[PDB]
Amino acid sequence: QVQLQESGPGLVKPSETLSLTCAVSGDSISNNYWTWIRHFPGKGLEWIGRIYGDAGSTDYNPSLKSRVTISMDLSKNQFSLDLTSVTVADTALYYCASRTTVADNWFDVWGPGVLVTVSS
Amino acid sequence: DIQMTQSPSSLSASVGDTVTITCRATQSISSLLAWYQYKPGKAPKLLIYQASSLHIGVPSRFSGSGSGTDFTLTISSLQSEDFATYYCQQHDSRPWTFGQGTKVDIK
Amino acid sequence: PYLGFCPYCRHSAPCFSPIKIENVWDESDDGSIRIQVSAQFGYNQAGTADVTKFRYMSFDHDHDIKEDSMDKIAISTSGPCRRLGHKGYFLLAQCPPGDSVTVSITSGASENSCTVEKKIRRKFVGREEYLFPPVHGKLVKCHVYDHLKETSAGYITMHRPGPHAYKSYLEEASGEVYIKPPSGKNVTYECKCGDYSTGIVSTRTKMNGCTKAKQCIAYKSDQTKWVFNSPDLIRHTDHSVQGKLHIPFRLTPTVCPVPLAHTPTVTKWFKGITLHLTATRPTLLTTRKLGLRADATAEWITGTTSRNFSVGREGLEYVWGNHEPVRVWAQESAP
Ligand SMILES: *[C@@H]1O[C@H](CO)[C@@H](O[C@@H]2O[C@H](CO)[C@@H](O)[C@H](O)[C@H]2NC(C)=O)[C@H](O)[C@H]1NC(C)=O
Ligand SMILES: *[C@@H]1O[C@H](CO)[C@@H](O)[C@H](O)[C@H]1NC(C)=O
Ligand SMILES: *[C@@H]1O[C@H](CO)[C@@H](O)[C@H](O)[C@H]1NC(C)=O
């Protein structure tokens, strides 16, 4: 089966590059869509972006397009998140998502997730 | 961007009752909708895909319907394990959006 | 499901048809062909896996999606074809020979058709020409497309569509331009009347400095549809491959029946052989020596005739039709 695990720093200063890691186990990286999802406490879920495995094609939310860049590492079974110049509104619970279907907005799989707090 | 107005925001009900939660979209999105069940301290799980179809493992008691802009989920024979947050999600426009969340709680 | 530039619409002209054929493959050994069209077969407006309905590209300014059934689908090359399977862009049909193939939707009186040049011939298996497979004969390995729809012959590449502009989106009145959108849908405009300008307005809005309606371009930001890398469309500013569906009806190896010819009547003479032959259809006869020089020859024989072949001491091997090759050896019976 496909298992996901988030692993990122929990406390980052504002106006700093946020780097978060989701590792993939049980399946290859190159034949499924890979997705980041945020979830601010006291609010709801919001889209971040996605990457395809063997192609490296990225589609991102237009509002955050200027500050979200997604890269993947096929050797480490790895795909990553880069968020530049974080603010206090970027404090959210972060999920990495994957699906049984090769590409679907709905995600069959989901990591436990990691909490990121932006404060001084 | 197609925006969402989740219905209703809150509803307290006991075990065995029937609660209906509506899903209204600002634009005609045909019947491409998916619903989620958020458990606190855990990742949300898919219950209904395609606005009428059941994910394997999900209870049959859960039945969603609707097309175009108006959608409903009917939760018949409510139990203790499914007091959660309800979230319908469309997959037409990029990127996908969410509701404001519907809270159900034990009366 | 996009719409393409079909070189033959209903009447005579190159026109736009939403069941536009790009290519046709005839690599099967049973005469069946597979057809790529721009429409989606076997899916509803939402794309539900449901066999009895399909969808296509609408002929209006809102560019939505409608539905239709297969009872008004006709496949033809010279006569009507027989339908066997369909997934999305893909077809499979059994057809008589012809110089082109025709797909059509006969939606009432609106018979929108598309015809693309492709030479389809009646091909055969083995060494004997045949029209319809006989009951009796040798069983031979052949290669046909599988009728199972969930197979995978390969992959095709799809990307996001580019801007698809309209004239119904733009309005001209008393020497200025206007933009009228459908209600509830954002439209991204682009116009140039001096300084280069962009923007996204979902409501009717005056634009200043413009006198001609041929200077502003408006298009809805459409991300819902996925389009094939077709030569008939303007692509988006980034050409990244984003996904891939299977190519169904994989060309699978199967056994096929082939006929057997009539067994020839063989007569004998000194250092030579003579075969009285009979075949109502063209069949192959290949003879070769068994020594230093093969002296190989091959002919397609129609009707009945007699062929003389010299046989040496080293011998000769002749193959008549689909039968077992038979080796013959001469003697030293000089008169
Ligand atoms: C499509 O048009 C609508 C209407 O302008 C935009 O709606 C905005 O939505 C956000 C989020 O709800 C609100 O905060 C704004 O107030 C709405 N408009 C305004 C001006 O207040 C919507 O963003 C548009 N989508 C795109 C992609 O432009
Ligand atoms: C009839 O004879 C012609 C040659 O004159 C030949 O080409 C044709 O195949 C024959 N048809 C038959 C088999 O009756
Ligand atoms: C074949 O050989 C026989 C016997 O020599 C002869 O009568 C006949 O004319 C020959 N026919 C051909 C095809 O040359």
Which residues of chain C are within 8 Å of residue B94 when distances are taken between CB atoms? Answer: 223
Task: Specify which residues B106 forms β-bridges with.
Answer: B13
Backbone φ and ψ of C24, nearest 5°? -130, 130
| Helices (H) then strands (E): counts for chain C | 0, 27
Nearest one of C147, C168, C179 to C60, comparing CA atoms: C168
* Alpha-carbon span C286 to C326, nearest angstrom: 11
**CB of residue C309 inside a 6 A radius of ligand 3:** no
Residues with Cβ within 8 Å of C100's Cβ and at least 6 positions away in sequence, in order, are: C77, C115, C116, C117, C118
* Alpha-carbon span C323 to C331, nearest angstrom: 25
Chains that touch A (3 or more CB pairs under 8 A): B, C
Residues with Cβ within 8 Å of C34's Cβ and at least 6 positions away in sequence, in order, are: C24, C25, C90, C91, C92, C93, C145, C249
* Alpha-carbon span C75 to C297, nearest angstrom: 42
Tokens coding B83: 């007091």
Mutate to test the interface with A, among B96, B97, B103 (most CBs of A within 10 A): B96
Tokens coding A36: 């980041």
Residue C306: count of CB within 10 angstroms of its CB: 11
Distance C314 CA to ligand 3 centre (A): 22
- C65 and B30 within 8 Å at the Cβ level: the answer is yes
Mutate to test the interface with C, among A31, A32, A59 (most CBs of C within 10 A): A59
Residues with Cβ within 8 Å of C311's Cβ and at least 6 positions away in sequence, in order, are: C271, C272, C273, C328, C329, C330
Backbone φ and ψ of A82, nearest 5°? -125, 120
Q: Atom 13 of ligand 2 has which residue's CA nearest to it?
A: C303
CB-based contacts of A72-77 (< 8 A; 24+ apart in sequence): A72/A29, A72/A34, A74/A29, A74/A30, A76/A23, A77/A23, A77/A24, A77/A25, A77/A28, A77/A29
SS3 B20: strand
Which residue stretches of C153-224 are H helix? none
Pick B43's closest partner by Cβ from A44, A59, A95.
Answer: A95
**CB of residue C305 inside a 6 A radius of ligand 2:** no
User: E-assigned strands of C180-264?
Assistant: 187-192, 196-197, 200-201, 205-206, 216-220, 227-228, 243-246, 251-258
Radius of gyration of chain A (CA): 14
* Core vs surface per residue C52-83: b (16+ CB within 10 A) or e: eebbbbeeeeebebeebeeeebebbbeeebee
What residue has token string 């070769």? C288
Pick C46's closest partner by Cβ from B27, B30, B94.
Answer: B30
* Alpha-carbon span C200 to C181, nearest angstrom: 11
Count Cβ atoms within 10 A of the Cβ of residue B56 and give its class: 0-12 exposed, 13-18 middle, 19 or more buried. exposed
SS3 C250: coil
Answer whether A20's CB lies under 8 Å from A118's CB.
Answer: no
Residues of B with CB under 8 A from a CB of C: 1, 26-28, 30-32, 50-51, 92-94
Which residue stretches of chain C are H helix? none
What residue has token string 């801007």? C163
Tokens coding B45: 């799980």
Min Cα distance A35 → chain B (Å) is: 12
- Backbone angle region of C194, left / alpha / beta, with phi > 0 → left and psi within -120 to 50 → alpha: left
SS3 C334: coil
- A44 and B99 within 8 Å at the Cβ level: the answer is yes
Tokens coding B18: 């029937």
Distance C45 CA to ligand 1 centre (A): 26
* Alpha-carbon span A48 to A54, nearest angstrom: 20
* Alpha-carbon span C248 to C154, nearest angstrom: 8
Residue C91 CA, distance from chain mean position? 8
* Alpha-carbon span C24 to B75, nearest angstrom: 50
CA atoms within 13 A of residue C264's CA, in its CB half-sphere: 28
Nearest one of C120, C142, C88 to C24, comparing CA atoms: C120
Backbone φ and ψ of B19, nearest 5°? -120, 140
Count Cβ atoms within 10 A of the Cβ of residue C321 and give its class: 0-12 exposed, 13-18 middle, 19 or more buried. buried
Max Cα separation, chain C? 112
Amino acid (one-letter) located at C39: A
Torsion of CA C192, C197, C200, C205, to 10 degrees: -60
DSSP state of C253: E
* Alpha-carbon span C252 to C250, nearest angstrom: 6
Tokens coding A48: 């971040």
Residue A50 CA, distance from chain mean position? 8
∠ Cα C312 C316 C321 (to 5°): 150
Answer whether C271's CB lies under 8 Å from C312's CB.
Answer: yes
Tokens coding B75: 């939760």
Distance C282 CA to ligand 3 centre (A): 22
| Helices (H) then strands (E): counts for chain B | 0, 10
* Alpha-carbon span C100 to C115, nearest angstrom: 7
Min Cα distance C289 → chain A (Å) is: 56
Pick C243's closest partner by Cβ from A56, A58, A103.
Answer: A103
DSSP state of C128: B
How many residues would you count in chain A?
Answer: 120
Radius of gyration of chain B (CA): 13
SS3 A90: helix
* Alpha-carbon span C101 to C36, nearest angstrom: 12
Beta-sheet pairing, A114-118 with A11-12: parallel
DSSP state of C263: P
**CB of residue C252 inside a 6 A radius of ligand 3:** no
* Alpha-carbon span A54 to C242, nearest angstrom: 10
Nearest one of C7, C142, C162, C147 to C90, comparing CA atoms: C147
Residues with Cβ within 8 Å of C293's Cβ and at least 6 positions away in sequence, in order, are: none
Which residues of chain B are within 8 Å of residue A46 when distances are taken between CB atoms? Answer: 98
Residue A50: count of CB within 10 angstroms of its CB: 23
Min Cα distance A70 → chain B (Å) is: 15
Residue C185: count of CB within 10 angstroms of its CB: 15
Pick B98's closest partner by Cβ from A45, A59, A111.
Answer: A45
Please give the method by which this entry was determined.
cryo-EM
Count Cβ atoms within 10 A of the Cβ of residue C109 and give its class: 0-12 exposed, 13-18 middle, 19 or more buried. exposed
Nearest one of B62, B69, B104, B107 to B83, comparing CA atoms: B104
Answer whether A13's CB lies under 8 Å from A61's CB.
Answer: no
3-state helix, strand, coil in chain A (%, to 5): 0, 50, 50
Q: Nearest residue of C to residue B3 by CA position? A: C184
**CB of residue C308 inside a 6 A radius of ligand 3:** yes
**Ligand 3 pocket: which of C308, C309, C310, C311 to mutate (most atoms within 8 A of CB):** C308
Tell me, letter by letter, the H, E, C secondary structure of A16-56: CCEEEEEEEECCCCCCCEEEEEEECCCCCEEEEEEEECCCC
Pick C224's closest partner by Cβ from B1, B26, B92.
Answer: B92
Distance C303 CA to ligand 2 centre (A): 7
What residue has token string 């989920």? B73
Task: Specify which residues C284 forms β-bridges with.
Answer: C300
Tokens coding C305: 């005739």
Tokens coding A63: 């509002």
Tokens coding C67: 């539905």
SS3 C215: helix
Beta-sheet pairing, A109-110 with A114-118: unpaired
Residue B2 CA, distance from chain mean position? 17
* Alpha-carbon span A103 to C188, nearest angstrom: 27
Nearest one of A40, C195, A39, A64 to A50, comparing CA atoms: A64
